[PDB]
Paper text:
The small unsaturated hydrocarbon is detected by a family of receptors (ETRs) located in the membrane of the endoplasmic reticulum, which rely on a monovalent copper cofactor to detect this hydrocarbon. The copper-transporting P-type [name] [name] ([name]), located in the same membrane, is known to be essential for the biogenesis of ETRs. The AlphaFold2 model also predicts three domains at the N-terminal end, all with ATX1-like folds (henceforth referred to as MBDs) and a Cα atom RMSD < 1 Å with respect to each other. MBD3 may function as an anchor, stabilizing the [name]-[name] complex while MBD1 and MBD2 are involved in a copper relay system.
To corroborate the AlphaFold2 23,28 prediction of a third ATX1-like fold domain at the N-terminus of [name], we expressed, purified, and analyzed this predicted domain by X-ray crystallography. The obtained crystal of the [name] MBD3 from [name] belongs to the orthorhombic space group P21221 with unit cell constants a = 50.755 Å, b = 51.481 Å, c = 62.722 Å. The crystal structure was determined by molecular replacement (MR) using the AlphaFold2 23,28 prediction of [name] (AlphaFold DB: Q9S7J8) cut to the sequence of MBD3 as a template. The structure was refined to a resolution of 1.98 Å with Rfree = 23.5% and Rwork = 19.2%, and MBD3 of [name] was modeled to completeness. The asymmetric unit comprises two molecules with an overall structural similarity (mutual RMSD = 0.355 Å; RMSDs to the AlphaFold2 model = 0.501/0.641 Å). The obtained crystal structure of MBD3 is consistent with the structure predicted by AlphaFold2 (Cα atom RMSD < 1 Å). However, the third domain (MBD3), which is the most distant from the N-terminus and the closest to the transmembrane domain, lacks the typical CBM. The cysteines have been substituted with asparagine and aspartate, in accordance with the results of sequence analysis by a multiple sequence alignment using Clustal Omega33. Noteworthy, a structurally related SxxS (SSRS) sequence motif is present in a loop region and α-helix 2 close to the C-terminus on the opposite side of the protein. Notably, MBD3 also showed copper-binding, with an EC50 MBD3 = 9.7 ± 1.1 µM.
Author numbering: 21 to 98
Write the structure that this text describes.
Amino acid sequence: FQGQQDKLVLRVDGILNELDAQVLEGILTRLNGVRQFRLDRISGELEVVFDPEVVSSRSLVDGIEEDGFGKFKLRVMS
């Protein structure tokens, strides 16, 4: 059956147009351990459901930043 599923809530800055959003969605879809996500392109709110046994929140946030080439600024919301 399915495994552990944790959630990470993020504020994303740097989405200036529809192209930037699709770039970000592409990064998330290719990131190992990401199971689902919801992105509001206008507010920058991003929720990510990930398997904590495959990727940690630490590695997940770092991965998006690295894959984004500094275009996206990530802040974790509590």
